[PDB]
Amino acid sequence: AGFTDYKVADITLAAWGRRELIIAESEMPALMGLRRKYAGQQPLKGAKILGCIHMTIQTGVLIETLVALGAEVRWSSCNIFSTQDQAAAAIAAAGIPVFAWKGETEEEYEWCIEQTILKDGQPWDANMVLDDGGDLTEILHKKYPQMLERIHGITEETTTGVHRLLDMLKNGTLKVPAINVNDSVTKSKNDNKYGCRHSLNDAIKRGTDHLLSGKQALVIGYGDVGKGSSQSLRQEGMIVKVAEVDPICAMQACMDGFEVVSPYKNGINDGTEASIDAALLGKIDLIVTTTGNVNVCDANMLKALKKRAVVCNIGHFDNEIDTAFMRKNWAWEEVKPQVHKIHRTGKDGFDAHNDDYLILLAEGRLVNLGNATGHPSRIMDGSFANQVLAQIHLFEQKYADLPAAEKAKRLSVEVLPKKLDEEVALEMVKGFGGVVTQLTPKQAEYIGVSVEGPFKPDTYRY
Amino acid sequence: GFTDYKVADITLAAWGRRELIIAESEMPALMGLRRKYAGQQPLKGAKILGCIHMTIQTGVLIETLVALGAEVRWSSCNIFSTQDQAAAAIAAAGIPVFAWKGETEEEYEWCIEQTILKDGQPWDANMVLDDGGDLTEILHKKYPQMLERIHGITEETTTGVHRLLDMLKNGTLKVPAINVNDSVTKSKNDNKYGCRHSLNDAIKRGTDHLLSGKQALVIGYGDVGKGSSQSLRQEGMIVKVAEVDPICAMQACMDGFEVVSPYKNGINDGTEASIDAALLGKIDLIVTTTGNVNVCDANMLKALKKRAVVCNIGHFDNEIDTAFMRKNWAWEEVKPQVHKIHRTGKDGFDAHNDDYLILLAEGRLVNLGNATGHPSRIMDGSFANQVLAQIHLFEQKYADLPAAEKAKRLSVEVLPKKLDEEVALEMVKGFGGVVTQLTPKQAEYIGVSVEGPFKPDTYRY
Amino acid sequence: GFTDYKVADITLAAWGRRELIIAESEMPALMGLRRKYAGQQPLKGAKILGCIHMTIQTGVLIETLVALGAEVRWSSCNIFSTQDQAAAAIAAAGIPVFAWKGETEEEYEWCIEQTILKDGQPWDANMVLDDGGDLTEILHKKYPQMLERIHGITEETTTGVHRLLDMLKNGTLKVPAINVNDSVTKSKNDNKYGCRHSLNDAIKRGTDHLLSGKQALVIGYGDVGKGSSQSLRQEGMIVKVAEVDPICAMQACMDGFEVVSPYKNGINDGTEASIDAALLGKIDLIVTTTGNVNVCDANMLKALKKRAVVCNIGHFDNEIDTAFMRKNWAWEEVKPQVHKIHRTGKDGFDAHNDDYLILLAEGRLVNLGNATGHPSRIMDGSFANQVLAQIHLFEQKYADLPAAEKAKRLSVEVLPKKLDEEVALEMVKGFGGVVTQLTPKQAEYIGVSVEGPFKPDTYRY
Amino acid sequence: AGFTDYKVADITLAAWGRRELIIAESEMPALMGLRRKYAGQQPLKGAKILGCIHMTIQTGVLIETLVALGAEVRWSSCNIFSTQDQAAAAIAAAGIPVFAWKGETEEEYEWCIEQTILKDGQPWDANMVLDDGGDLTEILHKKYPQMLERIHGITEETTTGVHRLLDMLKNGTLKVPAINVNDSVTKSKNDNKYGCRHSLNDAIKRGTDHLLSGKQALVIGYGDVGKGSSQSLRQEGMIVKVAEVDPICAMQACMDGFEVVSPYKNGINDGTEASIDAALLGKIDLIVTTTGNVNVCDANMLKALKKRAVVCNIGHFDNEIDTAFMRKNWAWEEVKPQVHKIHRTGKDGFDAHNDDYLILLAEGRLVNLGNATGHPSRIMDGSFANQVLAQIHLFEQKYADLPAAEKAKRLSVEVLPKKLDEEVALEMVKGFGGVVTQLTPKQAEYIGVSVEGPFKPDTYRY
Numbered sequence A, D: 001a002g003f004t005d006y007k008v009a010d011i012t013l014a015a016w017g018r019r020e021l022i023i024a025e026s027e028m029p030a031l032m033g034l035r036r037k038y039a040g041q042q043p044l045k046g047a048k049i050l051g052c053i054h055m056t057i058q059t060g061v062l063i064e065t066l067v068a069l070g071a072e073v074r075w076s077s078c079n080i081f082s083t084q085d086q087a088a089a090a091i092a093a094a095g096i097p098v099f100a101w102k103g104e105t106e107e108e109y110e111w112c113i114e115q116t117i118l119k120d121g122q123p124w125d126a127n128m129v130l131d132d133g134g135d136l137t138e139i140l141h142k143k144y145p146q147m148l149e150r151i152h153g154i155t156e157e158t159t160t161g162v163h164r165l166l167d168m169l170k171n172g173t174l175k176v177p178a179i180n181v182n183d184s185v186t187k188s189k190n191d192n193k194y195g196c197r198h199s200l201n202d203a204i205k206r207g208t209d210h211l212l213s214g215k216q217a218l219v220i221g222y223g224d225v226g227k228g229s230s231q232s233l234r235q236e237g238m239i240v241k242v243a244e245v246d247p248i249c250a251m252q253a254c255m256d257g258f259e260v261v262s263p264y265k266n267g268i269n270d271g272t273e274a275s276i277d278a279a280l281l282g283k284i285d286l287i288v289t290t291t292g293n294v295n296v297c298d299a300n301m302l303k304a305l306k307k308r309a310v311v312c313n314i315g316h317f318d319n320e321i322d323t324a325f326m327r328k329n330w331a332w333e334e335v336k337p338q339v340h341k342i343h344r345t346g347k348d349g350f351d352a353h354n355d356d357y358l359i360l361l362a363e364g365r366l367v368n369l370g371n372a373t374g375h376p377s378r379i380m381d382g383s384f385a386n387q388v389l390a391q392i393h394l395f396e397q398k399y400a401d402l403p404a405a406e407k408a409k410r411l412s413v414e415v416l417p418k419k420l421d422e423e424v425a426l427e428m429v430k431g432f433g434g435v436v437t438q439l440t441p442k443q444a445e446y447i448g449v450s451v452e453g454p455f456k457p458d459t460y461r462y
Numbered sequence B, C: 001g002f003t004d005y006k007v008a009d010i011t012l013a014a015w016g017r018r019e020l021i022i023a024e025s026e027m028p029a030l031m032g033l034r035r036k037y038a039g040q041q042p043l044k045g046a047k048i049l050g051c052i053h054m055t056i057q058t059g060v061l062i063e064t065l066v067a068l069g070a071e072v073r074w075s076s077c078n079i080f081s082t083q084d085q086a087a088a089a090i091a092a093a094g095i096p097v098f099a100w101k102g103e104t105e106e107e108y109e110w111c112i113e114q115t116i117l118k119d120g121q122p123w124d125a126n127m128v129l130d131d132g133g134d135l136t137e138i139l140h141k142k143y144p145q146m147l148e149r150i151h152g153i154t155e156e157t158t159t160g161v162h163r164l165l166d167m168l169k170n171g172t173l174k175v176p177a178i179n180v181n182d183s184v185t186k187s188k189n190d191n192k193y194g195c196r197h198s199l200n201d202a203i204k205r206g207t208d209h210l211l212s213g214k215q216a217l218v219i220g221y222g223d224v225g226k227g228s229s230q231s232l233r234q235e236g237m238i239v240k241v242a243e244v245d246p247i248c249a250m251q252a253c254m255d256g257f258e259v260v261s262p263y264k265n266g267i268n269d270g271t272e273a274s275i276d277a278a279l280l281g282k283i284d285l286i287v288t289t290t291g292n293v294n295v296c297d298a299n300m301l302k303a304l305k306k307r308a309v310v311c312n313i314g315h316f317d318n319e320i321d322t323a324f325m326r327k328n329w330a331w332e333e334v335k336p337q338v339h340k341i342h343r344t345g346k347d348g349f350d351a352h353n354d355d356y357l358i359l360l361a362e363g364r365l366v367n368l369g370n371a372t373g374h375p376s377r378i379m380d381g382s383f384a385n386q387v388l389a390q391i392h393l394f395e396q397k398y399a400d401l402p403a404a405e406k407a408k409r410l411s412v413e414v415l416p417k418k419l420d421e422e423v424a425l426e427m428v429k430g431f432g433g434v435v436t437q438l439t440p441k442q443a444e445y446i447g448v449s450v451e452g453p454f455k456p457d458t459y460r461y
């Protein structure tokens, strides 16, 4: 009834959005179980959550779970290209403040985050933070420190965001306790790997409709994202090569059946054209960055690529690829939104029939969300169940109400306990129809565990 | 006139040496350590009791320890795992070894006894290398005095580590130990990729069965279960996975496996009634990978599809209720380590009976029992970790510390990540892989040294 | 001012031409044909009625036929397969095209008639390019006189080749045809690898469902069933395969699939009691690939697990008994070409009902309906064969022969192996593959020319 | 006892052989189905079959199906290394003439074939021939042409053997009709492909116990054996490159996710050291030949292979590899039977620790049979049910008794009808517990087939 506290691309997409949310709910049994077990207890009664994460249909089920458990929220997306407009619209239509649309400008992105922080032109009395990448965390610490005084914690979604949180902690600049949601196994070894397995080839097909089978790929990185990216491409029949700086991850790539190569002769990146292994890069049809590092597909690499190669990044930020070099030197031709040919013939214009171009997806931004719809609902079930648990926990601990001395002892970056990790997994497994075996008392004795778990020591790597 | 050994057949030594020479080219991390430290002789003074599968790969581990100055006395940690030509080759070089493929339990206990006793008295051992904890166990139970001279234990495998931790918890562990299993260049290399290579290998050698198109059930989805499922799936088996750990079960689903229990609703009540007879009646092959007890029990064995293959790839045979099969069913030996278990009864059997199971390696570790275990280039990582672990604890000299300092170091520890990385680098180079070096700006960006380590200790890979 | 066409949106031409220029770089066999033949204008005088999915790939084919001298009038062979930016680009180049995504059945037949009729009279067509046999059928039945001027038909797909042979068998085929489907660079490329690429693509775009860990049932294991099963298995689906052909079933077993039937003992007696309700109740996704009628029937649909996805990738939508569902169940459009079918009845539905199926593309070709069909680099094979077949038959001038000579020329044939190999060579070079040339001695050894053909006509690849 | 008409390695191996035959019977339901359906009618009564094919456990079941149908046989192996000594022994212990053992010499090999052809010094009154590779066919036509007057047919198992029959037919030198067993679908596209998938990596593991994952393989040829060989290595995690002279098979390898390469620069094999791709071959850890052609792993390739590469051939004849060159120039070190280190440092002796060697399996003979046991029972079931049906047909046609005018009409090389092919596959499928669906009349009518089949036109490629 006269709700206006939102900004989306097209409110008339709400019904489409509601139809997809009702479907996603059937794909997210851990989340919906959290709704059922906790709705009547309202464990988030009083929570006022600032949320900054891809405004997908999946995020929308996360949002309505938080709201169903009593929280108020104000929401923005953490990438300019990751929002699904029908999901944004549906969340707005439900009366939840949201500021998000696919294809924002950098200025619009920053404006959207401020709309969650500011209500009626002043700071919202927020007390919780949910983040994916650290951008909202950053603007709170740098621009609105007084707001953190009233905030109980941050539940942080992804690898890069966690890295920034730990840097602040080691520098004494983190102001509130955080939960590392990324490092739950039902997140990092679910979302980060299998999710990219599902969505990377999906995004490339939608952007280019390129045949992948029999073509040559180079994946930069073999962490969780690189593992699943490599799989996404190999299961399509690509000849996949992997680069790494970490010899352990490189060992895994070898054992998984990949050839480990470096873009630089002898792996030495001295900044010269001559250090590029030009013979290797001239063979590559597709390069994907997965590192969370800076400039791992650099300007010389881009100069050396096979004509018409595809270039994309599935790490969290776009600075994995020297796209700025490309804007400075090469003419860009939009094929369609989030697909650009970059003509290496020069800056001022281009020949429509030039064969010396590259195809860049989503302008170097996260490609699975930029050119497709990111991870599927049933994978995001695990990540977003971890989020809800982390919110309940930090909100219950009321860090913001401690004396300065208790705050000091209490400031930390923690992970969810294994028992909760295990319980999230059980619901995911049940979602597939899987049937977990129950230990007998003698067996639980024999391996020194409780029949209900945990089943592994905290040191276990899975 | 060297006689301080017992093997099946010394004339196999030349064959074993030829195979040892090949393995050294397949093991760059291990050989790199042999070359790096031979000059220092960092194990000079060490007297290592070793108990681990006497394979060609173990032979390269053994000669490395010796090249770094150690004395050793060796046995196998399993009655079926020895490669007789590896055993022979070692003995022929004057290294005390007591091992043959096909031992009895009584012979197995004697072989360990021979490493412990020298000329009828306890050898002045000061180090232990163990796979599974059997040698750790006999020392603590029958020769506790010897542990006063021992500086530590380097334990190879999951089951062994678990056993060390239980002693630690209970206050019964007498010397410190390194958990070699949990290096990433071991657990996520040996335990997974090793079983991927060697499980289907062993099934083919024992039965020469086609695997494609048939139904498998793998009990467990830890590192050995993940690897074992892949061994079968890549051959075209339709693989189902059983697990008690929901996180591991979640991985199995995501990896494209159906997760099932042998019991209805996953609840074992010890009766035939709780068996999923319909599930088990369709299973062509069952593989135990758990390190737990009785995970292929008697009722399961009664319900299995006629002519199913039964085997275990965890450390100990009690994963399968073979005792029950020995009590009630007649065993027909096909060839060594391959038995038909005729479910028609105890006294005798019909040569053409169709109601049998096939048991590989009488339920012992099947990859070692029916083939040669892991390939040299995988063991390379495990055994380089072992050497580094031996060098560490030998240099600590725990047995010479005063009590209060002993109390500080009485623990089960893992190798530092820097070392784990260094082993991995040598392995990657073995494949011709090329690792990229970080630039100074890039290393500053992700907060690591250009030289590593590259991940926090929490990282799971 | 060119007005002889009808498309969804002519202002999409520029986007279509960008995608056409990209797709030319993905189609070396086809663009090679422009180069070898555009100087000789072998299709000069050709007037081709073309009816095939109006995609970016069809656009490149279309423009290649024109570059070699042909006039064309074009429609699509499916109501949902058109890409509108392609139709727009072709229109804007001055080529008669009648096609948009989401036509009705009435509009579909209208669109075909606008190719046949020009200024309200029969076009003076002399060639046919068809995919599925719909254009062919309307000529023989409604405009038989136009065939007296037509030299031949080049038919794209398995279903249409079957219809042609039905006519050749009955003596009702009026002009000769090339069976383009049965080129190896077509059937074993397009039918198989095209569906591998494009089936999971279309399901992702339709539903965004995770496929890993879910249960699929693929009906059929011909070339489309092979590709589709791989499309799902490589995503981590647990795939079951149904077949009526024991040879194709044997391949599915050997490929690592469990072969099952929707019916007990495989006997479809038309009753609910014949349905394997346990199997169907576990299936998360069902895919029809047979080219047969009603292989996903009403009782299977009643028995499917709640929220199962239902789709067909065979040429014609009668593979699925959608008429049953239209008669008995309420349909909720999720978005275009995605429908929840609420099995609670016909009189409306509950928005939060859980007993529904999801139908893609209303049972029409799902890869073209919910994505974009095969990728350019695969269609390259198919469409090089099409172009070559057009030259073959046009240079043959069958319509100018006397009846007694027509009789001897009236057939359904495939391209000679040599052309098949030439297309394949160009496809291989597109990947950067390097074919090895035989030595004269080697060629003599195996009994072939150094230039090929390399296999006897009986060879199955 | 009393019966002495055989020569095997060790007769005491008979009991172990019998045990493996009994197992194999349960793995071969088509063969044992044939045995049950026809033992009563005795369709092979009076047949006298010269058999020449790898004396494995699988061949033993085949031999005993024929005997069970009324035939007498006299048997040798078609390869010097392929016999299973316990199978040979079990067969001779059953009272069946067999002349076969693992590790024959060339002189001994032809002696064994001769011992099947002669009984008591005079030619045996044979009247049927079962061959694998055409060697038996070749000795009969060259050296005992009179015996062919009494012989009703040849049933030929393999591609090389079929090629040789067609060339004799074209030349007018083939004296009796033949059935091409290789080209049943339940043979070619089962045995030739899936058989090698099972048995290639099997043989390499038994010979060397080498890790295959992460290493570089080069497969020469991508026919049925090539397709199966490549899959055998790739499923182990090898990085596999494929070479081919047929562009259609090369197109399949690309789409199958393989890089297609040639050992020669630009594919051009002109016999020069300069034509070799030294860079490529210096990266190859394993080369497998699958072609049925001659010298496809030649001297210069052997010179250029990466130190310690493994070299093996899975084609029928060992001349795919230039082993004669290696015998002439390099020193062979036997690791164990059928495993040789070939020291490229010279011919006269070697350094025991030389690093510059190749590993040659089975001395270049069929590696799956030389170093392991060839195909598994359940695959050979398809090949060998075809063989039995083929024998029944040609023995019943009584070609050798027909008038000359009818001989000329029936002198051909034929394949089995598709209906029998389908019936073989049905038994196979059933052996896996697969359930084949029955068409309804309406459906049968709609695709124009009978409900009983055949279900495909003869042009169908599967």
Ligand SMILES: NC(=O)c1ccc[n+]([C@@H]2O[C@H](COP(=O)([O-])OP(=O)(O)OC[C@H]3O[C@@H](n4cnc5c(N)ncnc54)[C@H](O)[C@@H]3O)[C@@H](O)[C@H]2O)c1
Pocket (backbone or CB within 6 Å): A158, A159, A160, A161, A191, A192, A195, A196, A220, A221, A222, A223, A224, A225, A226, A243, A244, A245, A246, A249, A290, A291, A292, A293, A296, A314, A315, A316, A317, A366, A367, A368, A369, A374, A375, B436, B438, B442, B454
């Ligand atoms: N798009 C998505 O849906 C999604 C999902 C999860 C995470 N992510 C993001 O992806 C990135 C990687 O995440 P992760 O979980 O895989 O982290 P990770 O630490 O597990 O792996 C990144 C890897 O990159 C390697 N690397 C770093 N610099 C390199 C260089 N110069 N060359 C080659 N390799 C190099 C590191 O050794 C490391 O193994 C992060 O930005 C994370 O936030 C994206």
Ligand SMILES: NC(=O)c1ccc[n+]([C@@H]2O[C@H](COP(=O)([O-])OP(=O)(O)OC[C@H]3O[C@@H](n4cnc5c(N)ncnc54)[C@H](O)[C@@H]3O)[C@@H](O)[C@H]2O)c1
Pocket (backbone or CB within 6 Å): A437, A439, A443, A455, B157, B158, B159, B160, B190, B191, B194, B195, B219, B220, B221, B222, B223, B224, B225, B242, B243, B244, B245, B248, B289, B290, B291, B292, B295, B313, B314, B315, B316, B365, B366, B367, B368, B373, B374
């Ligand atoms: N054969 C070999 O070469 C080899 C190599 C390494 C380790 N191992 C042995 O294999 C065993 C497993 O080792 P791991 O490293 O995989 O250990 P792990 O802890 O990683 O895996 C064991 C798994 O079994 C599961 N499990 C336990 N009881 C179960 C039950 N009743 N039903 C189903 N699943 C059950 C656990 O949840 C766990 O995931 C140990 O005995 C280990 O020492 C053998």
Ligand SMILES: NC(=O)c1ccc[n+]([C@@H]2O[C@H](COP(=O)([O-])OP(=O)(O)OC[C@H]3O[C@@H](n4cnc5c(N)ncnc54)[C@H](O)[C@@H]3O)[C@@H](O)[C@H]2O)c1
Pocket (backbone or CB within 6 Å): C157, C158, C159, C160, C190, C191, C194, C195, C219, C220, C221, C222, C223, C224, C225, C242, C243, C244, C245, C248, C289, C290, C291, C292, C295, C313, C314, C315, C316, C365, C366, C367, C368, C374, D437, D439, D443, D455
């Ligand atoms: N969508 C696409 O892009 C595309 C591409 C090529 C062909 N097609 C179409 O797909 C269909 C199949 O083509 P194909 O080349 O694979 O034909 P095919 O003859 O190779 O295979 C069809 C298979 O279905 C099996 N089958 C028939 N009735 C069955 C039943 N009731 N139950 C189970 N299995 C049954 C047959 O035994 C046969 O093996 C045809 O309509 C063809 O025109 C579609």
Ligand SMILES: NC(=O)c1ccc[n+]([C@@H]2O[C@H](COP(=O)([O-])OP(=O)(O)OC[C@H]3O[C@@H](n4cnc5c(N)ncnc54)[C@H](O)[C@@H]3O)[C@@H](O)[C@H]2O)c1
Pocket (backbone or CB within 6 Å): C436, C438, C442, C454, D158, D159, D160, D161, D191, D192, D195, D196, D220, D221, D222, D223, D224, D225, D226, D243, D244, D245, D246, D249, D290, D291, D292, D293, D296, D314, D315, D316, D317, D366, D367, D368, D369, D374, D375
């Ligand atoms: N070891 C086994 O168990 C087994 C089983 C079946 C057949 N075979 C034998 O293996 C061989 C191959 O049989 P197949 O059925 O695959 O035959 P095939 O005709 O289908 O395949 C052989 C392939 O080799 C290719 N080729 C020829 N010369 C080449 C060259 N110089 N470089 C690269 N590729 C080249 C051909 O193009 C062809 O595709 C024959 O000798 C056959 O009898 C062995």
Ligand SMILES: Nc1ncnc2[nH]cnc12
Pocket (backbone or CB within 6 Å): A053, A054, A056, A058, A059, A195, A369, A373, A374, A375, A376, A380
């Ligand atoms: N679909 C999705 N929704 C939210 N965050 C995501 N991160 C990756 N995929 C995502």
Ligand SMILES: Nc1ncnc2[nH]cnc12
Pocket (backbone or CB within 6 Å): D053, D054, D056, D057, D058, D059, D195, D369, D373, D374, D375, D376, D380
């Ligand atoms: N096991 C086997 N027996 C007979 N012939 C074969 N050809 C390939 N493998 C074989």
Ligand SMILES: [K+]
Pocket (backbone or CB within 6 Å): A056, A058, A373, A374, A375, A376, A377, C208
């Ligand atoms: K999604």
Ligand SMILES: [K+]
Pocket (backbone or CB within 6 Å): B055, B057, B372, B373, B374, B375, B376, D209
């Ligand atoms: K080994």
Ligand SMILES: [K+]
Pocket (backbone or CB within 6 Å): A209, C055, C057, C372, C373, C374, C375, C376
């Ligand atoms: K397309």
Ligand SMILES: [K+]
Pocket (backbone or CB within 6 Å): B208, D056, D058, D373, D374, D375, D376, D377
């Ligand atoms: K065999």
